[PDB]
Amino acid sequence: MKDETYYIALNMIQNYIIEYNTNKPRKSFVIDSISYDVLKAACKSVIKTNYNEFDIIISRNIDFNVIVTQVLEDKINWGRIITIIAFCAYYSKKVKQDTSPQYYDGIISEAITDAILSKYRSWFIDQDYWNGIRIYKN
Amino acid sequence: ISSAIQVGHQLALIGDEFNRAY
């Protein structure tokens, strides 16, 4: 359900995707700013390294939620989480509507949150939520 | 890449490599 854990996950992911799309700082809207900055830097690295591959992936008739659930079907780790968020941020900006400021941050962030918490809620809590991402600080 | 390699499979490899690199 949509409990505290759900919002701890969702609020981090959705604020990052908003920042990526709008180029406005969103760290002050999350509780864990240190881990947000780690997430942001790690996604930036993934995108810089792999955007051409992402471009080929997105040129096809894709459902992003199938992609997300495929990554997490059998196991989770922080590199996987970072790569999902990075890909999905990159995707969101590419699929933004021309005639509205709709970049689908709601459905995309909720899908990522649900894919994490449907099978890995105890793992996430045991990581102390986003604290476990700090192993990727620089 | 072969169309038999699922897209999530490709992103999982990126993520597991990211762990190694960092």
Domain boundaries, chain A: 1-138
Beta carbons of A102 and A96 less than 8 angstroms apart: yes
The tokens describing A10, both together, are: 């969702």
**Which among B15, B6, B12 has a CA at the least distance from the CA of A57?**
B6
Beta carbons of A15 and A36 less than 8 angstroms apart: yes
C-alpha–C-alpha distance, residues A97 and A86, integer Å: 20
E strand or H helix at A43:
helix A33-58
**Cα A79 to chain centroid, rounded:** 11
Experimental approach was: X-ray
Partners of residue B16 in chain A, C-beta under 8 Å? 77, 79-80
C-alpha–C-alpha distance, residues A4 and A47, integer Å: 30
DSSP per-residue string spanning A66-121? HHHHHHTSS---HHHHHHHHHHHHHHHHHT--SSS----HHHHHHHHHHHHHHHHH
**Cα A37 to chain centroid, rounded:** 13
Between the two ends of chain A, the Cα-to-Cα distance in Å is: 34
Mutate to test the interface with B, among A47, A71, A78, A88 (most CBs of B within 10 A): A71
Partners of residue B6 in chain A, C-beta under 8 Å? 70
Beta carbons of B10 and A57 less than 8 angstroms apart: yes
C-alpha–C-alpha distance, residues A33 and A68, integer Å: 25
Distance from CA of A115 to the nearest CA of B (A): 13
Nearest neighbour of B19 by CB, restricted to A77, A84, A87: A77
